[PDB]
Design a binder for this molecule. Structure first.
Ligand SMILES: [Cl-]
Ligand SMILES: [Cl-]
Ligand SMILES: [Cl-]
Ligand SMILES: [Mg+2]
Ligand SMILES: [Mg+2]
Ligand SMILES: [Mg+2]
Ligand SMILES: [Mg+2]
Ligand SMILES: [Mg+2]
Ligand SMILES: [Mg+2]
Lengths: 326, 326, 326, 326, 326, 326
């Protein structure tokens, strides 16, 4: 940046703000539907639609209902969904075998969506915490610590089962060291040459995941990042890029826009951000109370674009796409 | 940033995360009470405390009551308050003369606080919109446009009145071009050599100010910044620094943490951020609903520190200070 | 850095200095107990406490006494100790076998502290100079030169014995080329996945180690760095990061704050610094003589934080923690 | 900095360390006598040499004695002296008039030295605190605050008196805002076109000045810098360069070597550093006690060179010069 | 670089130039004997000293005479010699076997100097052009092109024979791709752990080598660099650093000071420069004609230091060392 | 610079060197005649050509003879001449009045050339040293010091006289501070809006000017730059650009190519360099002696282009132009 000796009154920054036409001409960023990814909670069974108290307006959907809702998501131009299965309690186990079951919810939903909506991106969640008995992040040693490499073995099986089900993108959310490279080598070995890996690169140990936990039915500091740390996120992303990630993600979203910006600025790679359950809930609640105008939805999403995000995982994706088409 | 060829498994970023002691050693940023500024809403009477509906848990206080609660804020070590008077409708006018009234709420509160707590920082609000007939940002021309230099004349008189009342800091929130230099020159000519000017430098035309209206009882795009614009913020800050600001501020806060980052990175000057009414209300609502843990408060405030903020204007200051103490 | 055309009298840098509250608000760095690591000299035997003339106020402690003193170090919140055994003269030998003895002082002290204070970080010293016959840095060839790779073989055995004793961090202080990578591969091979390596990366051939030598009972230019060289430190650290170090350290401390700064700025990695025996002795002596106020202790430590250090090895850690709690 | 993929064992940084000749070839910085400035304490009488208790080995000297010892300093090639007069208590006053007295100690010493050693640089101290009733930094208001611009008026008269006495360099150590520009303009208007101004630009509110008080016989936070602050030093230096300083100084020295580094790196201007009384005393005390080898003197001074200093104000200048000669 | 708004007449850059003492204080670089390497031409036989018409004052020396002259080079403090054998015509051959002969001139001279002057650095020339029949750079294919990898095989044998003879540094001047890595691996494999490799990294196809060719008794564009190219030199040096060079050199010298500067600035590695035969001859000739003052010698060498060189190969090394001691 | 992991044998930098055509394609810089400025020595008579002993092949020419040879220079496409008058001793004086004489050699030559070759650039020398009694650089005070601002008064009158004579470019070589701004302001006030000012910005106190004295028939350290200093050159250039120079020059040339590089890199402004009399003489002497091939001329000039020069003042301009043509 060079200020170029710009000085009032020769320079008045209000002149460009004076009229809509000039504000439009100098506008640095615009949000479009191309930027939006919808996370969706997927139930077992048939003809199920369940509200989530902590996420007003978001429903968990059985696969038949998901296919029905998706017709309109596609009609709105939403490029991709991110699937989050709501695992039946009885399918949770010590070594998370359900993660790689070809008849698991994520795998079934994937095959169904790929057949019905061939152009719709399906991003699966590579993660053991939907399948472990008490939502722990992976396979535990005798001290209750999440074992890094052993958990990766299971994550790899899971990633392969998602690729087999036809997922165009797998997104590992587990925060094990080196899992991106492990998953990429396994995809490459098995001939899944074009399956994208969207790394959750700089994922923070956060209070903002609370409502998601309520939605899926479920310590973090030994794998997820300390919210205090910014330089560390660069090291996380550099490793995931070296290991072969096609896209890198920051999570949570708005509370870490500084991280989105540093990551985009330093690596110039496809950079994604998750506007998490907590962010959605606090915005929606404030809107319902009449504390915040509905225009806050697009403002919050524009923030991600300005900060350098290429795409945004957001529960507002349908509302935003509606407000963008209109 | 040099990645220095760090690679798994020689590099495992979980090793520093393994134990609390190493997490503490590598922790990049820590919030303290010396980062906190409490905004307070000030009433015109005596023995008055009112609850604000759209800001649950925030009260408007008469000066006598403000003096009482300030005992607690000072005991907690909160360095400064930012005063926001709740102007009676009868004192509102087209010329905003109440802005520089020696017996305006802001002026009376300042005098009372400076006398009772000589070490407590008082930051006054240099702004016409609390004093105009319908909350417009300044003096209007025939077209209803907020005239720049003519509004500045009033803001200067107001800043001088705050300095006369003993405010250590005046904070112009008006977003007229060149007002920082005009206020600084007036303060200098009048001999108020040490009155700090905290510029609201990069202040966005935002939906997040919604609940503030409910607190103080009140076209923004022609003076406040387009949320889409990041480069433009650097030009705003550069001008305010040239014009004599001792500190510069980004507003709103969490939706603009990338802006905080860029401003701190490029200017290396004292950088402040406002966690605005809508950010407070969003968080408080989710906490009250039991959707989010109370730990999000410290998490939200830590973000500002990590992003580069030196100080945070936050309605959570007392709560935060009590959590930091214990 | 962009100066932003800031000019007296519009800019007066004394305004922020005018009051405690504003000095606090703009304060760029603060020292906390999270930043402190205490080095401790450990004797053989029982019920031993020996003063060190060249390090007033520092005592060498047998393990029983160390456990007793540690209760209070932990109570003060000191996150970690760095152990320096005082090796009995008769246990020194040509090929430094004592370095890896499971019944060596460092190994015994480690097991005792890990059991008694499970949350306290134990940083061991990976070094052959406590175990060689005349304090030489490693294994000598027939010319009296310290052989690089042969010394690393012994250092690796030692590092493994520390990991076996339960040390969470091993800190190689030997300045052999490539020892960080050698030690990391051996830790990885043996399943010590989470043992941290705190590299003494840029360690200078220094006169400031004199009192430490007195404390432990003991040429340098062929392995330790020439104090003239700054660019070279970057090459040292880049290699240690590539080789898998979790933290990198500069030593001595205050005489090399420029190096701390370059290292933090260039690599953005966890950066440590040793305020060595000589630095402690000259400060303590000057304080005892009434030449320097006690406030110099916290000033010297604040310098490390400002310079970019994440943690500081300092014999003042107890005094500083006391003065920070109070 | 490009690490250029250097890796062990292809890269072994010990190879250049192997022999004295290669160490000499790669040596990045060398101290010489042309880096050294000797501060001297000057008495008001004749045939006077006094030992300073808190600065062992440093003497206060009458002008006749100063002239004698200067023969030795000149023979050693020390380029400049910095004069610090020891003002008799009777000459101290609220208006600090002695500061510009044509027969003040500083003015008499300057005239005598310029005549006797025409090639020797004389750096005078532009400062009010040697002349004020109780060593306060400048003229006080009713509240006991050091008034900026009014103190500057006195400093300007003083700088002019030093120039009239023939000083080649005036060095304002007062830390008033804008004094460099005010002194430069006065010097220019009076025709002292070639009088250099060595600004004390980044001078910290430090405990390290303790022994200086014992030498000269004498709220600092309101003009001197907070030790925590690094970015702020760049703003101080930028202003002094704009205002006409020929050289800029960091003070104290070794506790602020990161500041020396940053200042040299960003401005590429002649950069000076003061190894202050407390740094001297710390080192001298440890040497006298036999805790540190006398080689620490050259090591401490080499640090300044490596950090970026062009010149060092040091009480060790004569000792250093004798060591460099032999 | 930030100009810091420095402006005449507040800034007059002549003030620092006014007096010797201040010019000395701000002087950015100084040449010392530590910077000098003497190239020497070595004859077969005994009691030989031959003048070189194109290099006035430079003599070729048999080994006995070289030992005699070296006593004084060592007395002057010259840290190292670079040896250039004058190969007997009858020892030149198709496959340059003389390069690795343990009884070759370079090998014999090396053993003799290492025994007699153990502290003197001996830099040998790894090159096939002294041993090929018509001074071609290496082994020719059937088109007369210098084969890269086959020539490296011979260069490696030669480098090993120099290490065996005791050379502390080998300097490959051949400009084959990858020879630095090949030579380093062979040195490492054979246990020559500390033998330095001083790469001729960015060596240009130059007319300035003419007199050297006369001195040793002897197309270039297919291996030596085009004098037009600057970016290319960075690629050359990056590769040599990756391949394990301890020092990197630019050649010729003064006509490529821009390259010295870029190389030092970009890599921050030990950077050397050869002031070649042509540079020496044109300076010496101009001095002998009375066209240039003798002071041009030190000026030319100071240029290398200012440009960023750590050491200089120069036929003026004895004259310069004399003029530096005196 | 990103090395982009280029490694042998995948990267072989000899591949582009293999054939003339690829060498031509990758060639980074090319000298042309549009880079060349010819300095010429101008005599006061008619029918005069004199050989300069210390500049073999360079002639001093009367204006009539200059007009004749200029036919050839123009036919070769040389864009500009730099005039250096050879002032008769009778016209030399303490006040240097001949400098602005409308019938001075420089003024007469300019008028004659502008009329005869309207497209040929004429660069006059703004300098007092051709006109002062003993070749001193300007007007002297009682101490023999070259007074800055008083010399500038004469230089301004001279620059105006050159502009009146029709010079398109005035080039002040005097090294007084602020003279560029003073000349620019005078030219502007007099309406010479398009007269270019080519500042000698970074002109070193050099031995390389020796033969120039023999050409024109004639303490430098107090105005010309110390050869040791590089950072200082950037401050000199920044000032001249601020003061209105259209182009800036480094002098001497080849000994300061790092300075050319830094100046072009930092300012990106039209950058010129003087291959001075001593550089010419060194090269010419070696060529005449048969020590160096005539190809060194183009090699020396290509260096300037590669270093960043836009134009070169060179006594080889005619030779170079003839070589470039053929
Ligand atoms: Cl004030
Ligand atoms: Cl003067
Ligand atoms: Cl014109
Ligand atoms: Mg990771
Ligand atoms: Mg503005
Ligand atoms: Mg190392
Ligand atoms: Mg200042
Ligand atoms: Mg190469
Ligand atoms: Mg100049």
């Amino acid at each position: 940046f060079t200020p170029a000796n710009r000085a009032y009154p020769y320079t008045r920054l209000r002149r460009n703000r004076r009229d809509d036409f000039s504000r439009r001409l100098v506008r640095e960023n615009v949000l479009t539907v191309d930027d939006l990814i919808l996370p969706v909670f997927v139930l077992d069974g048939v003809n199920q639609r369940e509200s989530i108290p902590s996420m007003p307006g978001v429903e968990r959907l059985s696969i038949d209902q998901l296919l029905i809702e998706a017709e309109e998501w596609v009609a709105l131009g939403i490029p991709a969904l991110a699937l989050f299965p709501v695992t039946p309690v009885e399918k949770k186990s010590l070594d998370a075998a359900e993660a790689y079951n070809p008849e698991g919810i994520a795998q079934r939903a994937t095959r169904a969506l790929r057949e019905r909506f061939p152009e719709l991106g399906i991003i699966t969640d590579v993660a053991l915490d939907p399948f472990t008995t008490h939502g722990q992040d992976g396979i535990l040693d005798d001290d209750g610590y999440v074992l890094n490499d052993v958990s990766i073995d299971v994550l790899v099986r899971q990633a392969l089962s998602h690729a087999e089900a036809g997922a165009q993108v797998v997104a590992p959310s587990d925060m094990m060291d080196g899992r991106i490279g492990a998953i990429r080598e396994a995809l490459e070995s098995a001939g899944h040459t074009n399956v994208r890996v969207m790394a959750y690169s700089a994922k923070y140990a956060s209070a903002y995941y609370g409502p998601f936990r309520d939605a899926v039915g479920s310590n973090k500091a030994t794998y997820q990042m300390d919210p205090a740390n910014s330089d560390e996120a660069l090291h996380e992303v550099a490793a995931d890029l070296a290991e072969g990630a096609d896209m890198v993600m920051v999570k949570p979203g708005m509370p870490y826009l500084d991280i989105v910006r540093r990551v985009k600025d330093e690596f110039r790679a496809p950079t994604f951000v998750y506007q998490v359950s907590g962010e959605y809930a606090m915005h929606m609640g404030a809107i319902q109370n009449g504390w915040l105008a509905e225009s806050v939805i697009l403002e919050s999403l524009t923030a991600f674009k300005r900060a350098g995000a290429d795409g945004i995982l957001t529960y507002f994706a349908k509302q935003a796409a509606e407000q963008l088409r209109r």
